[PDB]
PDB file of C-alpha atoms in Angstrom:
ATOM      1  CA  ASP A   1      -0.002  -0.035   0.005  1.00 50.08           C
ATOM      2  CA  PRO A   2       2.017   3.058  -1.155  1.00 51.68           C
ATOM      3  CA  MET A   3       0.348   5.118   1.699  1.00 51.00           C
ATOM      4  CA  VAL A   4       1.761   2.663   4.263  1.00 50.16           C
ATOM      5  CA  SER A   5       5.131   2.764   2.485  1.00 49.44           C
ATOM      6  CA  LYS A   6       5.384   6.564   2.756  1.00 52.24           C
ATOM      7  CA  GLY A   7       5.195   6.238   6.639  1.00 52.71           C
ATOM      8  CA  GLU A   8       7.596   3.313   6.609  1.00 53.62           C
ATOM      9  CA  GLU A   9      10.172   5.086   4.613  1.00 52.97           C
ATOM     10  CA  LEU A  10       9.947   7.952   7.172  1.00 54.05           C
ATOM     11  CA  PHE A  11      10.114   6.066  10.462  1.00 52.67           C
ATOM     12  CA  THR A  12      12.203   2.952   9.480  1.00 52.00           C
ATOM     13  CA  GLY A  13      15.345   3.427  11.577  1.00 54.49           C
ATOM     14  CA  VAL A  14      16.270   5.601  14.557  1.00 49.51           C
ATOM     15  CA  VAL A  15      14.862   9.194  14.099  1.00 48.54           C
ATOM     16  CA  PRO A  16      16.291  12.222  16.040  1.00 45.86           C
ATOM     17  CA  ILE A  17      13.721  14.082  18.089  1.00 46.92           C
ATOM     18  CA  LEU A  18      13.597  17.699  19.295  1.00 50.13           C
ATOM     19  CA  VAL A  19      10.926  19.004  21.839  1.00 51.71           C
ATOM     20  CA  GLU A  20      10.321  22.594  22.878  1.00 53.95           C
ATOM     21  CA  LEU A  21       7.796  23.770  25.406  1.00 52.76           C
ATOM     22  CA  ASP A  22       6.725  27.226  26.469  1.00 50.84           C
ATOM     23  CA  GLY A  23       4.729  27.045  29.694  1.00 48.54           C
ATOM     24  CA  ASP A  24       2.751  29.469  31.961  1.00 48.63           C
ATOM     25  CA  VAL A  25       0.985  27.906  34.951  1.00 48.36           C
ATOM     26  CA  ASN A  26      -0.812  30.465  37.245  1.00 46.29           C
ATOM     27  CA  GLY A  27       1.718  32.956  35.896  1.00 46.37           C
ATOM     28  CA  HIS A  28       4.693  30.788  36.716  1.00 46.50           C
ATOM     29  CA  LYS A  29       6.511  30.982  33.375  1.00 44.35           C
ATOM     30  CA  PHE A  30       8.956  28.374  32.136  1.00 45.01           C
ATOM     31  CA  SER A  31      10.617  26.694  29.082  1.00 45.41           C
ATOM     32  CA  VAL A  32      11.721  23.241  28.516  1.00 47.28           C
ATOM     33  CA  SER A  33      13.900  21.790  25.641  1.00 42.11           C
ATOM     34  CA  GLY A  34      14.165  18.025  25.067  1.00 41.89           C
ATOM     35  CA  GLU A  35      16.343  15.930  22.727  1.00 42.14           C
ATOM     36  CA  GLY A  36      16.457  12.195  21.967  1.00 46.67           C
ATOM     37  CA  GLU A  37      15.458   9.626  19.388  1.00 44.86           C
ATOM     38  CA  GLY A  38      12.671   7.344  18.418  1.00 47.84           C
ATOM     39  CA  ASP A  39      12.558   3.918  16.885  1.00 44.91           C
ATOM     40  CA  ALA A  40       8.984   3.231  15.886  1.00 45.13           C
ATOM     41  CA  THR A  41       9.984  -0.277  14.763  1.00 43.31           C
ATOM     42  CA  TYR A  42      10.220  -1.075  18.558  1.00 40.45           C
ATOM     43  CA  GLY A  43       7.702   1.565  19.798  1.00 37.74           C
ATOM     44  CA  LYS A  44      10.729   2.950  21.589  1.00 37.05           C
ATOM     45  CA  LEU A  45      11.428   6.717  22.685  1.00 37.46           C
ATOM     46  CA  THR A  46      14.453   7.933  24.590  1.00 38.33           C
ATOM     47  CA  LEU A  47      14.284  11.629  25.616  1.00 36.31           C
ATOM     48  CA  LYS A  48      15.986  14.050  28.045  1.00 38.42           C
ATOM     49  CA  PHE A  49      14.203  17.276  28.920  1.00 36.97           C
ATOM     50  CA  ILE A  50      15.841  20.331  30.534  1.00 36.18           C
ATOM     51  CA  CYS A  51      14.134  23.272  32.166  1.00 36.04           C
ATOM     52  CA  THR A  52      16.142  26.030  30.611  1.00 35.17           C
ATOM     53  CA  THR A  53      14.522  28.936  32.732  1.00 36.93           C
ATOM     54  CA  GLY A  54      15.712  27.263  35.965  1.00 38.28           C
ATOM     55  CA  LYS A  55      13.344  25.406  38.502  1.00 41.69           C
ATOM     56  CA  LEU A  56      10.436  23.706  36.822  1.00 39.94           C
ATOM     57  CA  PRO A  57       7.361  25.139  38.755  1.00 37.13           C
ATOM     58  CA  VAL A  58       5.285  21.905  38.371  1.00 36.51           C
ATOM     59  CA  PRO A  59       6.131  18.223  38.902  1.00 36.81           C
ATOM     60  CA  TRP A  60       8.050  16.640  35.846  1.00 40.74           C
ATOM     61  CA  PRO A  61       5.579  13.643  35.949  1.00 41.38           C
ATOM     62  CA  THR A  62       2.720  16.087  35.087  1.00 43.18           C
ATOM     63  CA  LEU A  63       4.313  16.889  31.677  1.00 43.51           C
ATOM     64  CA  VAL A  64       5.014  13.364  30.504  1.00 46.79           C
ATOM     65  CA  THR A  65       1.901  13.028  28.363  1.00 41.03           C
ATOM     66  CA  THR A  66       2.494  16.472  26.870  1.00 40.81           C
ATOM     67  CA  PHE A  67       6.142  15.746  25.988  1.00 43.64           C
ATOM     68  CA  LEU A  68       5.023  11.612  20.068  1.00 43.25           C
ATOM     69  CA  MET A  69       2.423   9.010  19.096  1.00 44.42           C
ATOM     70  CA  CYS A  70       3.934   8.786  15.637  1.00 44.68           C
ATOM     71  CA  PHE A  71       6.519   6.562  17.262  1.00 45.72           C
ATOM     72  CA  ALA A  72       4.002   3.907  18.344  1.00 44.35           C
ATOM     73  CA  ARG A  73       4.676   0.391  17.180  1.00 44.56           C
ATOM     74  CA  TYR A  74       1.623  -0.602  15.032  1.00 45.77           C
ATOM     75  CA  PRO A  75       1.639  -4.432  14.465  1.00 49.16           C
ATOM     76  CA  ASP A  76       1.631  -5.344  10.808  1.00 48.52           C
ATOM     77  CA  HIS A  77      -2.108  -6.265  10.846  1.00 46.77           C
ATOM     78  CA  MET A  78      -2.936  -2.688  12.183  1.00 49.15           C
ATOM     79  CA  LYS A  79      -0.803  -0.605   9.811  1.00 46.83           C
ATOM     80  CA  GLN A  80      -3.885   0.687   7.971  1.00 47.98           C
ATOM     81  CA  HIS A  81      -4.993   2.392  11.313  1.00 49.20           C
ATOM     82  CA  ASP A  82      -1.780   4.469  12.071  1.00 50.77           C
ATOM     83  CA  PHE A  83      -3.125   8.043  11.626  1.00 50.45           C
ATOM     84  CA  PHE A  84      -0.037   9.551  13.239  1.00 50.86           C
ATOM     85  CA  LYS A  85       2.564   8.332  10.714  1.00 50.67           C
ATOM     86  CA  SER A  86       0.172   8.898   7.780  1.00 52.53           C
ATOM     87  CA  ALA A  87      -0.041  12.700   8.538  1.00 53.58           C
ATOM     88  CA  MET A  88       3.817  12.920   8.133  1.00 53.95           C
ATOM     89  CA  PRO A  89       6.013  14.603   7.055  1.00 54.66           C
ATOM     90  CA  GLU A  90       3.646  17.672   7.155  1.00 54.66           C
ATOM     91  CA  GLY A  91       2.573  16.597  10.601  1.00 53.19           C
ATOM     92  CA  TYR A  92      -0.380  17.024  12.852  1.00 54.45           C
ATOM     93  CA  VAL A  93      -1.657  19.256  15.649  1.00 51.63           C
ATOM     94  CA  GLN A  94      -2.209  17.634  19.049  1.00 54.05           C
ATOM     95  CA  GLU A  95      -4.387  19.579  21.581  1.00 57.61           C
ATOM     96  CA  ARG A  96      -5.381  18.694  25.100  1.00 57.49           C
ATOM     97  CA  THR A  97      -7.183  19.799  28.197  1.00 58.33           C
ATOM     98  CA  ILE A  98      -5.823  18.066  31.270  1.00 59.34           C
ATOM     99  CA  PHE A  99      -8.075  18.340  34.311  1.00 59.30           C
ATOM    100  CA  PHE A 100      -6.290  17.742  37.614  1.00 61.66           C
ATOM    101  CA  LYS A 101      -9.031  16.475  40.054  1.00 61.21           C
ATOM    102  CA  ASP A 102      -9.544  19.094  42.808  1.00 60.40           C
ATOM    103  CA  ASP A 103      -6.960  21.373  41.374  1.00 58.87           C
ATOM    104  CA  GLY A 104      -6.261  23.252  38.118  1.00 56.03           C
ATOM    105  CA  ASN A 105      -6.064  22.474  34.459  1.00 53.10           C
ATOM    106  CA  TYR A 106      -3.487  22.414  31.592  1.00 52.32           C
ATOM    107  CA  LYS A 107      -4.420  23.353  28.120  1.00 54.86           C
ATOM    108  CA  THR A 108      -1.857  22.382  25.477  1.00 55.16           C
ATOM    109  CA  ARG A 109      -1.286  22.954  21.803  1.00 53.34           C
ATOM    110  CA  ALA A 110       1.338  21.015  19.934  1.00 53.14           C
ATOM    111  CA  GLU A 111       2.615  20.803  16.410  1.00 52.65           C
ATOM    112  CA  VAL A 112       4.342  17.580  15.592  1.00 53.71           C
ATOM    113  CA  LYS A 113       6.141  17.374  12.332  1.00 54.20           C
ATOM    114  CA  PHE A 114       9.390  16.864  10.440  1.00 57.18           C
ATOM    115  CA  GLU A 115      11.985  19.599  10.137  1.00 55.35           C
ATOM    116  CA  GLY A 116      14.273  17.819   7.694  1.00 53.92           C
ATOM    117  CA  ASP A 117      15.401  14.517   9.218  1.00 51.99           C
ATOM    118  CA  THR A 118      14.340  15.660  12.691  1.00 50.55           C
ATOM    119  CA  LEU A 119      11.033  14.892  14.183  1.00 50.64           C
ATOM    120  CA  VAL A 120       9.906  18.063  16.119  1.00 52.67           C
ATOM    121  CA  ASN A 121       7.293  18.565  18.949  1.00 53.24           C
ATOM    122  CA  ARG A 122       6.643  22.346  19.505  1.00 56.16           C
ATOM    123  CA  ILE A 123       4.349  22.913  22.528  1.00 54.89           C
ATOM    124  CA  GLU A 124       2.608  25.780  24.266  1.00 56.22           C
ATOM    125  CA  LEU A 125       1.019  24.930  27.643  1.00 55.52           C
ATOM    126  CA  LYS A 126      -1.219  27.267  29.740  1.00 56.29           C
ATOM    127  CA  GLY A 127      -2.255  26.123  33.186  1.00 56.65           C
ATOM    128  CA  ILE A 128      -4.960  27.946  35.253  1.00 54.82           C
ATOM    129  CA  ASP A 129      -6.709  27.575  38.498  1.00 52.13           C
ATOM    130  CA  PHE A 130      -4.139  25.760  40.404  1.00 51.91           C
ATOM    131  CA  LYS A 131      -3.822  25.671  44.154  1.00 51.51           C
ATOM    132  CA  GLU A 132      -0.681  27.343  45.494  1.00 46.50           C
ATOM    133  CA  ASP A 133      -0.146  24.601  47.942  1.00 45.85           C
ATOM    134  CA  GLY A 134      -1.834  21.736  46.075  1.00 50.59           C
ATOM    135  CA  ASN A 135      -0.207  18.683  44.714  1.00 50.63           C
ATOM    136  CA  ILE A 136       1.052  20.314  41.525  1.00 48.87           C
ATOM    137  CA  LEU A 137       2.267  23.838  42.578  1.00 45.33           C
ATOM    138  CA  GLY A 138       3.318  22.338  45.987  1.00 45.11           C
ATOM    139  CA  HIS A 139       5.347  19.574  44.287  1.00 45.82           C
ATOM    140  CA  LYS A 140       3.689  16.638  46.184  1.00 43.21           C
ATOM    141  CA  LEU A 141       3.756  14.019  43.361  1.00 43.88           C
ATOM    142  CA  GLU A 142       6.237  11.146  43.378  1.00 47.60           C
ATOM    143  CA  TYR A 143       8.902  10.882  40.596  1.00 45.36           C
ATOM    144  CA  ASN A 144       7.479   7.765  38.925  1.00 44.93           C
ATOM    145  CA  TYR A 145       4.875   6.738  36.414  1.00 45.27           C
ATOM    146  CA  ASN A 146       2.261   4.056  35.993  1.00 44.89           C
ATOM    147  CA  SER A 147       1.438   2.115  32.717  1.00 44.51           C
ATOM    148  CA  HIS A 148      -1.671   3.170  30.899  1.00 45.39           C
ATOM    149  CA  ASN A 149      -3.881   2.215  27.846  1.00 46.61           C
ATOM    150  CA  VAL A 150      -5.087   5.224  25.736  1.00 48.22           C
ATOM    151  CA  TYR A 151      -8.222   4.563  23.499  1.00 47.38           C
ATOM    152  CA  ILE A 152      -7.994   6.206  20.062  1.00 49.02           C
ATOM    153  CA  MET A 153     -11.144   6.909  18.096  1.00 50.10           C
ATOM    154  CA  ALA A 154     -11.869   8.621  14.678  1.00 49.04           C
ATOM    155  CA  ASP A 155     -13.142  12.245  14.874  1.00 46.75           C
ATOM    156  CA  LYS A 156     -14.387  11.861  11.201  1.00 49.48           C
ATOM    157  CA  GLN A 157     -16.067  15.307  10.901  1.00 46.77           C
ATOM    158  CA  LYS A 158     -12.606  16.869  11.725  1.00 47.17           C
ATOM    159  CA  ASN A 159     -10.553  14.517   9.528  1.00 47.63           C
ATOM    160  CA  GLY A 160      -8.653  13.381  12.669  1.00 49.24           C
ATOM    161  CA  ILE A 161      -8.797  11.586  15.945  1.00 47.32           C
ATOM    162  CA  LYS A 162     -10.034  12.022  19.515  1.00 47.80           C
ATOM    163  CA  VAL A 163      -8.546  10.402  22.681  1.00 46.12           C
ATOM    164  CA  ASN A 164      -9.821  10.383  26.265  1.00 48.93           C
ATOM    165  CA  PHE A 165      -7.856   8.816  29.133  1.00 47.67           C
ATOM    166  CA  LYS A 166      -7.069   8.985  32.849  1.00 48.45           C
ATOM    167  CA  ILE A 167      -3.554   9.189  34.327  1.00 44.79           C
ATOM    168  CA  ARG A 168      -3.118   8.572  38.056  1.00 45.42           C
ATOM    169  CA  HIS A 169      -0.055  10.298  39.592  1.00 48.98           C
ATOM    170  CA  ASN A 170       1.101   8.815  42.901  1.00 51.41           C
ATOM    171  CA  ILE A 171       1.096  11.576  45.656  1.00 53.38           C
ATOM    172  CA  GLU A 172       3.904  11.299  48.354  1.00 53.59           C
ATOM    173  CA  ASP A 173       1.260  10.520  51.103  1.00 54.61           C
ATOM    174  CA  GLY A 174       0.324   7.260  49.225  1.00 52.68           C
ATOM    175  CA  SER A 175      -2.822   8.690  47.551  1.00 52.15           C
ATOM    176  CA  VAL A 176      -3.274   9.533  43.871  1.00 54.84           C
ATOM    177  CA  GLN A 177      -3.766  12.658  41.823  1.00 51.55           C
ATOM    178  CA  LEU A 178      -6.110  11.995  38.839  1.00 53.52           C
ATOM    179  CA  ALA A 179      -5.317  13.793  35.630  1.00 55.08           C
ATOM    180  CA  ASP A 180      -8.262  13.394  33.140  1.00 57.18           C
ATOM    181  CA  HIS A 181      -6.938  14.028  29.618  1.00 55.26           C
ATOM    182  CA  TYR A 182      -9.103  15.053  26.709  1.00 56.45           C
ATOM    183  CA  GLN A 183      -7.278  15.179  23.361  1.00 54.73           C
ATOM    184  CA  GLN A 184      -7.921  15.994  19.585  1.00 57.88           C
ATOM    185  CA  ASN A 185      -5.401  15.635  16.721  1.00 58.66           C
ATOM    186  CA  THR A 186      -5.827  17.010  13.212  1.00 58.32           C
ATOM    187  CA  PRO A 187      -3.457  16.892  10.165  1.00 60.98           C
ATOM    188  CA  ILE A 188      -1.539  20.038   9.343  1.00 60.18           C
ATOM    189  CA  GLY A 189      -1.444  19.060   5.581  1.00 60.62           C
ATOM    190  CA  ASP A 190      -4.313  18.885   3.055  1.00 58.37           C
ATOM    191  CA  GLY A 191      -3.400  15.323   2.007  1.00 58.08           C
ATOM    192  CA  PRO A 192      -5.246  12.150   2.796  1.00 60.19           C
ATOM    193  CA  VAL A 193      -4.662  10.448   6.198  1.00 60.77           C
ATOM    194  CA  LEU A 194      -5.515   7.030   7.612  1.00 62.12           C
ATOM    195  CA  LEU A 195      -8.517   7.382   9.970  1.00 62.82           C
ATOM    196  CA  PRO A 196      -8.478   4.506  12.367  1.00 65.50           C
ATOM    197  CA  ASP A 197     -10.899   1.954  13.779  1.00 65.92           C
ATOM    198  CA  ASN A 198     -11.202   2.178  17.554  1.00 70.90           C
ATOM    199  CA  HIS A 199      -8.123   0.763  19.148  1.00 73.65           C
ATOM    200  CA  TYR A 200      -5.674   1.622  21.888  1.00 72.58           C
ATOM    201  CA  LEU A 201      -2.008   2.422  22.532  1.00 73.74           C
ATOM    202  CA  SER A 202      -0.316   0.703  25.372  1.00 75.02           C
ATOM    203  CA  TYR A 203       2.108   3.002  27.264  1.00 77.36           C
ATOM    204  CA  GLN A 204       5.038   2.146  29.558  1.00 78.47           C
ATOM    205  CA  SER A 205       7.052   5.033  30.939  1.00 79.83           C
ATOM    206  CA  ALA A 206      10.216   5.203  33.163  1.00 82.45           C
ATOM    207  CA  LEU A 207      11.462   8.382  34.603  1.00 84.30           C
ATOM    208  CA  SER A 208      15.100   8.806  35.690  1.00 82.77           C
ATOM    209  CA  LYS A 209      17.860  11.454  36.242  1.00 84.43           C
ATOM    210  CA  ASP A 210      21.188  12.119  34.495  1.00 86.08           C
ATOM    211  CA  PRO A 211      23.689  11.788  37.272  1.00 88.06           C
ATOM    212  CA  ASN A 212      25.829  14.331  35.473  1.00 87.37           C
ATOM    213  CA  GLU A 213      23.107  16.929  34.978  1.00 86.20           C
ATOM    214  CA  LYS A 214      22.932  19.802  37.468  1.00 83.08           C
ATOM    215  CA  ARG A 215      19.902  21.509  35.836  1.00 83.58           C
ATOM    216  CA  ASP A 216      16.271  20.603  36.581  1.00 85.51           C
ATOM    217  CA  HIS A 217      15.652  17.759  34.087  1.00 84.05           C
ATOM    218  CA  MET A 218      13.837  14.570  33.289  1.00 82.32           C
ATOM    219  CA  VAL A 219      15.032  11.504  31.419  1.00 82.60           C
ATOM    220  CA  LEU A 220      12.109   9.577  29.864  1.00 80.57           C
ATOM    221  CA  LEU A 221      12.029   6.098  28.386  1.00 83.06           C
ATOM    222  CA  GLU A 222       8.713   5.117  26.849  1.00 83.87           C
ATOM    223  CA  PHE A 223       7.457   2.076  24.917  1.00 86.61           C
ATOM    224  CA  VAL A 224       4.234   2.409  22.964  1.00 86.41           C
ATOM    225  CA  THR A 225       2.428  -0.362  21.193  1.00 85.80           C
ATOM    226  CA  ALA A 226      -0.879  -0.269  19.282  1.00 89.21           C
ATOM    227  CA  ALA A 227      -3.337  -3.036  20.045  1.00 89.51           C
ATOM    228  CA  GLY A 228      -7.059  -4.025  20.387  1.00 87.47           C
ATOM    229  CA  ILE A 229      -7.742  -4.804  16.741  1.00 88.79           C
ATOM    230  CA  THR A 230      -7.269  -8.598  16.833  1.00 92.58           C
TER     231      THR A 230
END
């Protein structure tokens, strides 16, 4: 299928990634740059993010979902349902609202596309209605991450997809902070895209630190595999 080919010839090997995020949460401004690489053949992403404005004013785990579904490993039988690669190289927009239960919300707008050989994720994040002393602004979330399925469905009237999922962040007192994600993606180009049947992406995420890095940072290793079309 020459449409499936076009995605394959773009993602076949290891692909360098760049991420840039401009953030404002309750008027706490910040910027984050990330660099790493993806290997969609394995559903594998390796990234390191650095807060370049100094202290990150929110917990690093809260930004993981915001910081590359094109790197998902789609099994051979599911290749006709991979919207994300099909929108490349021109890319797609990924927008979310993330509602932190009993606290504020993030609203994010991203553009994911190629700049030459580099796969780039440019993000603006606006956070409002946070509590000063809550889990997020008061940095009460543990530096870890649970595995999660994410259910993708077609958003046919917008030529794209919608995604709805819950992340549970462990709080230091042993409880959990729910972050309810609502997401929409739309192609940036005017070309045809693959619109999928309902399926899900399975996420595994590991957070770590670069022992040689003095700046505020996060190392992220993610594996992402499509499933649920048998």
